[PDB]
Amino acid sequence: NFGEFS
Amino acid sequence: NFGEFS
Amino acid sequence: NFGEFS
Amino acid sequence: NFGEFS
Amino acid sequence: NFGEFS
Amino acid sequence: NFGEFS
Amino acid sequence: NFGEFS
Amino acid sequence: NFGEFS
Amino acid sequence: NFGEFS
Amino acid sequence: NFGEFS
């Protein structure tokens, strides 16, 4: 699981 | 599961 | 942007 | 930006 | 930036 | 699990 | 920047 | 697990 | 910059 | 586990 990336 | 990405 | 997840 | 996850 | 995760 | 990256 | 994780 | 990177 | 982790 | 890098 992870929050976010760009 | 993950939050978001762009 | 987001609050939370599980 | 995000709050939290598990 | 993010708050926390586990 | 990880928070974020760019 | 982030607060904490485990 | 890790916090963030760029 | 970040606060802490374990 | 690690905090961050650039």
Residues of F in contact with A3 (CB under 8 A): 2-4
Q: Which residues lie across from I2 on neighbouring strands?
A: G2
Long-range contacts (CB closer than 8 Å, 24 or more residues apart) made by C1-6: C1/D1, C1/D2, C2/A4, C2/B3, C2/B4, C2/D2, C2/D3, C3/D2, C3/D3, C4/D2, C4/D3, C4/D4, C4/D5, C5/A1, C5/B1, C5/B2, C5/B3, C5/D5, C5/D6, C6/B1, C6/D5, C6/D6
Both tokens of F6, joined, read 């760019």
Q: What is the resolution of this structure in A?
A: 1.0
CA dist E3 and D2 (Å) reads 7
**H or E stretch including A3?**
strand A2-5
The position carrying tokens 């942007």 is: C1
Method used experimentally: electron diffraction
Cβ <8 Å between H6 and F3: no
